[PDB]
Amino acid sequence: NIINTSILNLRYESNHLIDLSRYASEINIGSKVNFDPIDKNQIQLFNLESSKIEIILKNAIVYNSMYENFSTSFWIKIPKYFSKINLNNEYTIINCIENNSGWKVSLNYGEIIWTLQDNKQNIQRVVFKYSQMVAISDYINRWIFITITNNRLNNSKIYINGRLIDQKPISNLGNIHASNNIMFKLDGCRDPQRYIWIKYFNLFDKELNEKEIKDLYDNQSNSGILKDFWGNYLQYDKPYYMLNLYDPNKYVDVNNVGIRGYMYLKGPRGSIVTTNIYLNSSLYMGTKFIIKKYASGNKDNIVRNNDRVYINVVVKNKEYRLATNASQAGVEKILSVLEIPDVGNLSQVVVMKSKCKMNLQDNNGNDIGFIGFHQFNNIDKLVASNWYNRQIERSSRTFGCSWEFIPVDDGWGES
Ligand SMILES: [Cl-]
């Protein structure tokens, strides 16, 4: 009952951020903290003095020890670094240093850093490094799960998405006497535009093990809710650029609208670059998808596992309906986009599944198949194919039928 026994459990319930732990530490929120209205556990901190959260710890849990083990976890979503000003600029984001001793989380260009400091000028730093010179990044502007553990007799460890990345001995450190407060605030950042998103902060008064960490990752992933590429909840009525996970240098296009045209994967993507700062594939390419309410959605705008939907496709600034005639030859049913008034009795009902998958069905509820792609001669056409469904029934791996939904996001910054 690992979150339940945490010594600090910050969560947004009804109308307030609160510490749910038995300690009920005090929270002070600055004027310029922003909470996402879709999910107010998602907290945005700007490079402003009033964009801060302070936690006043109960005296019982202030860290002051040579020997006590402790850990912290949280999720973070860090916008792409765009500017030379971001190089060589380590900035604190979670501060628990007082009198030059304690702990802190800081960031730098392509880095997440944990620092410990004793009362005898000793220091230890574990670091996660990620590149901005990468076609498609797992990390830039995407939610990722951080976990840091500390065993005073041996090592400090940093985990990303449940996996151990770095470790260093901390037996070079004597007494660590951390602050009575924890300050969530960008401290020392030279770039006025910088911000972070954070969520689900916890402290623990032991060293978490690998298993506990993986289980926290899985539990906090919200697996009944589909996610977009950035890790935010997938929504209805929101345009998405599509990325097929088996061929990430292509985007979705449509040769011609109507039943005699088809959807296909076209490449290459272009690139976006700032010399010495980033070099990535362009994400805002192709014919956008919009998820439309059909049988689900009666409570909010969020797309959930097993929701039945329609998919609209934007072609030259007009919406069309993804559909197919399942009567066509062969298992692989080539997808088209149809004028919405003219879709008739074509197969168009999509069952969303949480990576994201889409199972096409006819109007009687029979499966046409998962949406993927199939090579016909020299073209990768989008299809619905029951071959995928039958491989899943046999517990066999399937390639080509998993998708990313990429909305425009300011933390990506592409035009
Ligand atoms: Cl795949």
Residue numbers in the entry: 872 to 1225, 1234 to 1294
Kindly provide excerpts from the paper associated with this entry.
Clostridium botulinum neurotoxins (BoNTs) cause flaccid paralysis through inhibition of acetylcholine release from motor neurons; however, at tiny doses, this property is exploited for use as a therapeutic. Each member of the BoNT family of proteins consists of three distinct domains: a binding domain that targets neuronal cell membranes (HC), a translocation domain (HN) and a catalytic domain (LC).
Here, we present high‐resolution crystal structures of the binding domains of BoNT subtypes/A5 (HC/A5) and/A6 (HC/A6). These structures show that the core fold identified in other subtypes is maintained, but with subtle differences at the expected receptor‐binding sites.
